[PDB]
Amino acid sequence: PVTLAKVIKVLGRTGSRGGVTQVRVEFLEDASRTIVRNVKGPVRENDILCLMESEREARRLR
């Protein structure tokens, strides 16, 4: 039961070395429940990344 979330805003690089990016995701269906998540690879806005788990927001990383 994976869920896909289109990206709408690239907040910024987080993590110690800057290798992970905070992003604001919007679900493909039910275009709400917008969540902030961290992504490993390079990201522009409007990239559809699938989520193994949906019920968890994200904040700044160490």
């Binding site: 896909l4 690879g41 390079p42 990344l49 193994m52």
Partner: protein, 206 residues
Amino acid sequence: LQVVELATTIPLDVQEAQREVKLFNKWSFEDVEVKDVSLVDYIQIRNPVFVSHTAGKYASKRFRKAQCPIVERLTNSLMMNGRNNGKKLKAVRIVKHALEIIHVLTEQNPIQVVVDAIVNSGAREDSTRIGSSGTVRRQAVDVSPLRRVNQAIALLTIGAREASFRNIKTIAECLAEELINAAKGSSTSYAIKKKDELERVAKSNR
């Protein structure tokens, strides 16, 4: 449909390419579609090429790599381990043979299996490390489609390389076995073992 006669005679079969541009004049892009909504825009099969060798500039800007043909990115990752760097004509010959072997086996479109094997090979959640100057503290974060796509090609070709080392099976047919198995999601293949282990560990960090 008409056969056009030139002073320099052109064989019949190769001219039957004016209708459609096909990979090695044998494989069609029309019936290939990515069975993943999330990697359609970063696996490039919309612009057909005859041979997987374009010598383009995909390293100038940031996301130019996604516009490179998925097969040329595959033949690019083949030339590794020092002694093979720059041997692209060898890589195209190797890729070309792999496609034929993938066709006689499972009888599907070889370039469809390539897209399926790559989409089935990218881990969807990886555990990045967040150690604060030495301590172990990994945290599970998501993986963007480009790193998901292009790590699949790296893992797919890396597994084939090691399977052909000190082995009578040729790299093209070690690659063919690696590509078909990852295409079918089989756990026997390398890069599916690896993909499963990353997404398993990432769940153990959230």
